[PDB]
Design a protein around this ligand. Structure first.
Ligand SMILES: [Ca+2]
Ligand SMILES: [Ca+2]
Ligand SMILES: [Ca+2]
Ligand SMILES: [Ca+2]
Ligand SMILES: [Cl-]
Ligand SMILES: [Cl-]
Ligand SMILES: [Zn+2]
Ligand SMILES: [Zn+2]
Lengths: 26, 368
């Protein structure tokens, strides 16, 4: 005791990102 | 590169993965070939080794999801977030989920499943996002190019900080991203664009605003997916709001972010002969409506206004601008001064007094 997974989860997950920005803008 | 806190590392070299489900936009095999290609990237430069399981539970669990799809973090429909991965660990650790609201392809369309995987697998192996725009592990997606993929040096360095190297990397030479402050730095092309300075080197350009000292570093395909990686030459038509870009015998006109109608054209249409197989450097003069085009030790003066080469050309660089050697890598002009880049040197040529005012390292344009 006490009983709990001290590293239960990771916030350190990271995402790749591509912007919704757009063509033909002049 | 960046690793994660505590230096989250797999403690085993022989790892396992499982493709739970598949994108509709691709065939199972086309999909299996990608992920396998994607691990190969990392395996080629580490002791690591990947084995695909066909059932049960693997280290890396690969699935496709839509919106809220299980984990607390949901996907966002088309574009935006492309996927996400967890750092090395017990269960959710190592996993990678991909957005199924995406058109996964093995081409320049949709989003390249192999490119996005390679990146996201890196997280799975312990690499955090990199700040280097040259790195695969950079936070923002960009279609690298049609050409055969090479893993950037930042990435090789980062992953080997954890595990590497391995016995025989099949092509050791990995692309380093240019160093603004290396006094051997030599430039490919330079132009103004909307008041800012554009400096091309390899698959990158710096954009340096008159009011900044640190330039930003973009990948060229980040702006113009269609343009090549290396640029030979570039120049602007400011008042007409437009930038011209040369590579080999093709040349493009561009208005901000898009190619003009029916580009690229052949440089022959510019009046050049056939033996001229590249423009080395180019500068336009808004004053007079004319453009200098350099090739080899020669120079052409073309009438950008009336669309025709001036008569009496070509002339030798060494006549019209003596003392700058016999080649020109990149050139721009500002307020009566022409700046001629020959290797790691830059010459400041005064149109006024018709000679070289000062001489200085090429990288001093990058505030070095
Ligand atoms: Ca998405
Ligand atoms: Ca796992
Ligand atoms: Ca050049
Ligand atoms: Ca130029
Ligand atoms: Cl990711
Ligand atoms: Cl140039
Ligand atoms: Zn990422
Ligand atoms: Zn998820």
């Amino acid at each position: 005791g006490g009983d709990e997974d001290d590293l239960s989860e990771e916030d350190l997950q990271f995402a790749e990102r591509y912007l919704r920005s757009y063509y033909h803008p002049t | 590169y960046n690793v994660f806190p505590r230096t989250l590392k797999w403690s085993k070299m022989n790892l396992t993965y499982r493709i739970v489900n598949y994108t509709p936009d691709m065939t199972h095999s086309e999909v299996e070939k990608a992920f396998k290609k994607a691990f190969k990237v990392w395996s080629d430069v580490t002791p690591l080794n990947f084995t695909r399981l066909h059932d049960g539970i693997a280290d890396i669990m690969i699935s496709f999801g839509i919106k809220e799809h299980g984990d607390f973090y949901p996907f966002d429909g088309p574009s935006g977030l492309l996927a996400h991965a967890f750092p090395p660990g017990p269960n959710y650790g190592g996993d990678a989920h991909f957005d199924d609201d995406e058109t996964w392809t093995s081409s320049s369309k949709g989003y390249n499943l192999f490119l996005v995987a390679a990146h996201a697998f890196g997280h799975s192996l312990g690499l955090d996002h990199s700040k280097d725009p040259g790195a695969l592990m950079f936070p923002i997606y960009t279609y690298t190019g049609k050409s055969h993929f090479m893993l950037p040096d930042d990435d090789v360095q980062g992953i080997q900080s954890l595990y590497g190297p391995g016995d025989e990397d099949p092509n050791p030479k990995h692309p380093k991203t240019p160093d603004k402050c290396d006094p051997s730095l030599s430039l490919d092309a330079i132009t103004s664009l909307r008041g800012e300075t554009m400096i091309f080197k390899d698959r990158f350009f710096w954009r340096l605003h008159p009011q900044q000292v640190d330039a930003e570093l973009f990948l060229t395909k980040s702006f113009w997916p269609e343009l090549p990686n290396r640029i030979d030459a570039a120049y602007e038509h400011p008042s007409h709001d437009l930038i011209f870009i040369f590579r080999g015998r093709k040349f493009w006109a561009l208005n901000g972010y898009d190619i003009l109608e029916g580009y690229p054209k052949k440089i022959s249409e510019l009046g050049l002969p056939k033996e001229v197989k590249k423009i080395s450097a180019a500068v336009h003069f808004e004053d007079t409506g004319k453009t200098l085009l350099f090739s080899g030790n020669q120079v052409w003066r073309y009438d950008d206004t009336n669309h025709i080469m001036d008569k009496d050309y070509p002339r030798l660089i060494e006549e019209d601008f003596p003392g700058i050697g016999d080649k020109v890598d990149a050139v721009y002009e500002k307020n009566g001064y022409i700046y001629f880049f020959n290797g790691p040197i830059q010459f400041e040529y005064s149109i006024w007094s018709n000679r070289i005012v000062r001489v200085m390292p090429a990288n001093s344009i990058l505030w070095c």
